[PDB]
Amino acid sequence: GSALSPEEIKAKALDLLNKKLHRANKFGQDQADIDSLQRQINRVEKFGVDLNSKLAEELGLVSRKNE
Distance CA 56, CA 62 (A): 6
Distances (CA, A) of 4 to 24, 27, 31, 38: 27, 32, 31, 23
φ and ψ of 66, to 5 deg: -140, 155
* Residue boundaries of the structural domains of the chain: 1-67
Displacement of CA 40 from its chain's centroid (Å) = 6
| DSSP summary character for residue 60 | T
